[PDB]
Amino acid sequence: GTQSKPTPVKPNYALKFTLAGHTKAVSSVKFSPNGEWLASSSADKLIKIWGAYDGKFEKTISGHKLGISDVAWSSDSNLLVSASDDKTLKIWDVSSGKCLKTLKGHSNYVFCCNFNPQSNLIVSGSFDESVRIWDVKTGKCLKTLPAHSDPVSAVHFNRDGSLIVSSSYDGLCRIWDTASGQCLKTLIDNPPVSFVKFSPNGKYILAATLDNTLKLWDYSKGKCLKTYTGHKNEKYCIFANFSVTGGKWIVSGSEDNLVYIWNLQTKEIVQKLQGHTDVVISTACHPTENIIASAALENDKTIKLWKSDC
């Protein structure tokens, strides 16, 4: 008979795999767009690739001279970009494991990176207080944005690549026009903004501040629509995610070693995932299935894969 919409009140994420192999803190985990792989970066100077579904170690990618803060996938899942304390980014062929380009220009640690949807560009944020825009094909820096007055905590492209959002310890989030490099909007109280990214519809940004607060902003109207709290975040730049494959949740790590999951709309906590033995610095949501990756700092050094029915 009739067709209906499931409206789960909570997910039921359960631990399936614990991925060991990094020898220092894990800094970042990201699922490939095609859903097949997980990439991890670490202070141990390595990238590791794992099967997204079974956790199975696939390969180690090496070449950076110091720790890696961040990794990101190209849209076609064939390339990775990495951000390192060696002041460089590296573009990698995931198949061969080899470095295609080294992106030189930042004058201090590179903290965050992302490809645009077309994946002809990379954006980076650095302790040097700048955001750079790079040409994937040549590896040359196209633009340097004097974006902030303190380290840049996150950079993210919107769904057509026309906008970049940046955050910083200076307390600001800024929206930039990719084409011109000009600021379009500043969101300014000002605790350190530890993380930012665009919503899947392009209309909102989710932003973490080091006052134990996540906020969903409509940035055209500069109005905070939703606030998520109850977790611990006063020190680290912790990634946060929209989970969109089942119920609509907000996911973040926490300094109390748990993964927090909130109902996006009600703003209530629906689950806390226990298992890590250090700060959960990074979380990622699988693009088509209800799968969370989480990763922790050096007391733990593991990645965990959690699966839900909704």
Place this chain on the structure above:
Amino acid sequence: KPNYALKFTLAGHTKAVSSVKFSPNGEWLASSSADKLIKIWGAYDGKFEKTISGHKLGISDVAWSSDSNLLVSASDDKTLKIWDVSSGKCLKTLKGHSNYVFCCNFNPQSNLIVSGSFDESVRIWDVKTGKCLKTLPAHSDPVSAVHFNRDGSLIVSSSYDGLCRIWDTASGQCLKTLIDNPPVSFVKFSPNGKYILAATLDNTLKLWDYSKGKCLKTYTGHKNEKYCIFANFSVTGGKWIVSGSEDNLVYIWNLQTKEIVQKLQGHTDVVISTACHPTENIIASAALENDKTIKLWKSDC
């Protein structure tokens, strides 16, 4: 060059799908069907949201109000219905047509609805009162499409009679006829308001400057000899023309080169309807009764 790839297949209709339209706020997709139902789906995730019901026979067409809060539907039951999308309730039934209602649209301001019917008329309705304001004796055969200009001052209509006409909304008087005349199966204004895209049942789409009554571009390679197939301007990425086709593919042309930049394969019947998301490179397509599904396709460019 686009790289549309299949992301979602939306099943639920039990007969042919007739029409798919994205809400102006970008959040929803509405579908109409021969099964007498409207279905709402999330534009980004394909997720079934709700079913809206009340028509006594099949539905040919649906359209959104500018504020995304209302739908209007055109039915073989000879009525249009205005719906509150939130509640799913019918607010008004628009009675007047003496045969199937084939096509409908709100004006940009969404105080008016325009309709086209097998009765060969175009009607202009008052959204707030539901009364028929004007009946245009527009055509000498079923009306295939009706569409308001960017400012609501004009209406374009097409018909199997082979004519495309532009009407003055305020007076209901014809302003121009573009007339060597295969059935005109679809027509709509460009986002600019300057041009008109028209389909004819000779496997041809044509872009017309209607101020200069000259055909500027011609798009072929698709099959269209039988059905009234929607066509679109895609303006979120590159400038493309999108249309369904009787060979079960979605065609995308470079507007200027008139070259087939892509063909989207997946449907197992005539692709009767396509829509382009208002702010993202997302295509909705929908097919007839061998298929009965809607598909959502996404590109980066």
